[PDB]
Ligand binder design. Structure first.
Ligand SMILES: Cc1cc2nc3c(=O)[nH]c(=O)nc-3n(C[C@H](O)[C@H](O)[C@H](O)COP(=O)(O)OP(=O)(O)OC[C@H]3O[C@@H](n4cnc5c(N)ncnc54)[C@H](O)[C@@H]3O)c2cc1C
Ligand SMILES: [Cl-]
Length: 635
């Protein structure tokens, strides 16, 4: 037993300083929230994990079942650096391996990693703490049970009042912190932030150090107009849906121990918009660093990781992570791509490429230059949705197919559900995930959701078409052959106000026309043949700002009456009015394969009142009431 590896230190300063592991056992909630300034090689996180795992082995019936860890790192290391430093701590080896298996690219923003079969949520915030904290969401307030105040020795950049004030704002009352320093200005900084502070002996030799406790909740400037309320009960949830996002939301809720039931109008899941054979998965970038791009940057990477974790657990679905090549086939598209390339992306996420480079990758002359997304690809969303639905079923979700909801009505603390004609059901909490049909309710009909038919053609491959290795995106898209069926998909029509799903010949020809029109300089696209008239049709739910809608279903009448006064006020203002115990997720447009997993996880986390994985503007930009709140916020 030495001190030289720094493991005993970590345990003394950060775990014991916050009352662990004793505190695991007395902890009164199902989850415990830790936050850390810095992350480094993960020493504090891995040590905590190890202890929390020993505690779960020893007390499988204790209240505490889950750990959430929030970390702020300005200088994210590469996974090889992580591996190299973890050689010092072989006793952490197996936790370390699971961590490194999911370590993300150095992209600015929040990256949520699900570890230990869902018992651990790791929110990695890559960016400067100081510029980050004022951007964070109200869902982080009053949440944190214990802080690991780590980093360089008070170098002074990090240890300002702005950090201490954010920390207290984010601390639950009774929540605590510990740090390795005892610098006077840090002590004074944490007191003025609102903590009680105690000075104690450092580990072994040097230093004194500091611990403390937040005696009272800091009521801090909120944004009540974009409030994200929890469900009061998660032991009785009914999902109305049956597409990709219903299954992901199911699973994200089951990880938290919710009980969920599915009602789906069709005989089978994935008979709506989620039913194609091959769909494209890549991020939507703009180079504007707005809410849209911020969301898609997190969403894409989060979706790839979840899809890989699922595949690792034995879930099966056709797919190739073959890369996506988006072509500058046009003045407009070239301009858009040019703007994206002004932000400096790691080439592991998005890379500018010449016509030659794209074609080299593609196996076919791509006719233009553009941008390449090497982790994008295609998946069979039909297989994926059936697979995730099956998994949710195996894990406890009962499924009632051919249950088209016709009437939804709150009565005496329950939602009464009338179908088309099976028995009426009633539930404490409901979630609407019905895609293009979302705004058909008296409760949802003032939400600006638009419905857009598309038709995707199914085409036989040929020796030349088989050569294609990437998804090609132009004004439309063409996937590589699915080697399991020897067919490709090429789409898609985009018909606003049109919800019929009948095969149309005109639209079948247009899927080929689009390709021929956008790559006129090459001849292989002539090998596309749509004359067997095989296609699939479906209907997207589009939103004019191109971002999903996820959250509580907002109450129009009360919102307008309650915020007529809002602009003058900006005071202590009431939270956004909503229908009680009613939530929604959808508005996925044409990018649901990319956006679905993160919105699902956002919705589950919200309904459980947990900290959310995005900043305030990006969450406000996903909130269902946003188009209204935007007006009222200016008059
Ligand atoms: C032509 C086309 C091309 C596409 N290409 C891509 C692509 O390249 N990449 C990509 O990521 N995505 C693509 N998409 C999919 C897009 O991402 C969709 O927005 C997404 O699949 C919708 O998923 P969802 O779960 O929200 O809704 P859906 O899959 O449409 O499911 C809605 C479900 O709700 C059920 N329902 C509706 N009303 C009721 C009711 N009253 N009672 C009970 N149940 C009800 C239905 O039974 C249905 O199962 C494409 C879609 C289309 C149509
Ligand atoms: Cl699809």
């Amino acid at each position: 037993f030495s001190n030289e590896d720094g493991l005993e230190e970590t345990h003394h300063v950060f775990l014991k300083g916050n009352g662990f592991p004793a505190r695991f056992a007395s902890h009164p909630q199902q989850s415990c929230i830790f936050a850390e300034t810095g992350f480094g090689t993960g020493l504090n996180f891995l040590t905590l994990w190890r202890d929390f795992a020993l505690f779960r082995q020893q007390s499988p019936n204790a209240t505490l079942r889950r750990l959430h860890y929030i970390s702020f790192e300005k200088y994210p290391l590469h996974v090889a650096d992580l591996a190299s430093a973890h050689a010092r701590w072989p006793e952490l080896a197996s936790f370390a391996e699971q961590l490194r298996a999911q370590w993300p690219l150095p992209l600015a923003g929040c990256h949520r990693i699900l570890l230990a079969d869902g018992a651990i949520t790791l929110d990695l915030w890559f960016g400067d703490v100081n510029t980050l904290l004022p951007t964070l969401d109200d869902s982080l307030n009053n949440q944190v049970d214990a802080w690991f105040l780590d980093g360089f020795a008070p170098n002074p950049d990090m240890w300002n009042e702005q950090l201490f004030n954010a920390m207290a704002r984010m601390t639950r009352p009774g929540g605590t912190f510990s740090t390795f320093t005892a610098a006077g200005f840090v002590r004074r900084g944490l007191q003025q932030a609102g903590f009680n502070v105690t000075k104690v002996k450092g580990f072994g030799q040097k230093r004194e150090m500091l611990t403390g406790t937040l005696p009272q909740q800091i009521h801090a400037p909120t944004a009540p107009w974009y409030h994200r309320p929890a469900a009061t009960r998660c032991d009785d949830i009914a999902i109305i849906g049956g597409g990709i996002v219903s299954a992901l939301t199911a699973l994200a809720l089951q990880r938290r121990g919710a009980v969920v039931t599915l009602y789906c109008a069709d005989a089978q899941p994935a008979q709506g918009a989620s039913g194609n054979r091959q769909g494209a998965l890549y991020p939507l970038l703009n180079g504007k660093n707005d809410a849209l791009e911020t969301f898609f940057t997190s969403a894409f990477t989060f979706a790839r990781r979840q899809y890989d974790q699922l595949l690792e657990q034995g879930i099966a679905f056709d797919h190739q992570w073959c890369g996506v090549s988006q072509l500058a086939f046009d003045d407009k598209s070239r301009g858009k791509i040019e703007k994206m390339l002004h932000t400096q992306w790691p080439v592991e996420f998005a890379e500018a490429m010449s016509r030659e480079q794209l074609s080299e990758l593609a196996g076919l002359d791509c006719a233009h230059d553009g941008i390449h997304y090497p982790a994008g690809g295609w998946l069979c969303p039909s297989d994926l949705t059936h697979a995730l639905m099956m998994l949710a079923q195996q894990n406890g979700m009962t499924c009632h197919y051919q249950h088209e909801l016709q009437r939804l009505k709150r009565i005496d603390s329950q939602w009464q559900l009338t179908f088309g004609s099976q028995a009426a059901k009633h539930h404490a909490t409901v979630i609407l995930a019905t895609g293009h049909r979302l705004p058909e309710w008296e409760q949802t009909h003032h939400l600006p959701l638009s419905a857009v038919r598309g038709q995707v053609s199914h085409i036989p491959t040929t020796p030349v078409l088989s050569q294609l290795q990437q998804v090609l995106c132009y004004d439309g898209y063409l996937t590589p052959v699915n080697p399991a069926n020897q067919h490709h998909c090429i789409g898609a029509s985009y018909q606003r106000g049109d919800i019929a799903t009948d095969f149309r010949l005109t639209e079948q020809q247009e899927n080929r026309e689009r390709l021929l029109r956008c790559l006129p300089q090459v001849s292989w696209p002539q090998q596309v043949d749509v004359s067997d008239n095989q296609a699939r049709c479906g209907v997207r739910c589009a939103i004019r700002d191109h971002l999903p809608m996820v959250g509580a279903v907002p109450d129009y009448a009360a919102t307008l009456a309650q915020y007529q006064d809002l602009s003058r006020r900006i005071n202590d203002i009431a939270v956004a009015p909503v229908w009680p115990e009613l939530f929604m997720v959808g508005g996925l447009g044409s990018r649901g394969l990319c956006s679905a997993p993160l919105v699902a996880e956002i919705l589950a986390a919200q309904m459980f009142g947990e900290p959310l994985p995005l900043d305030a503007k990006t969450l406000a930009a996903l909130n269902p009431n946003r188009f209204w709140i935007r007006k009222l916020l200016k008059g």
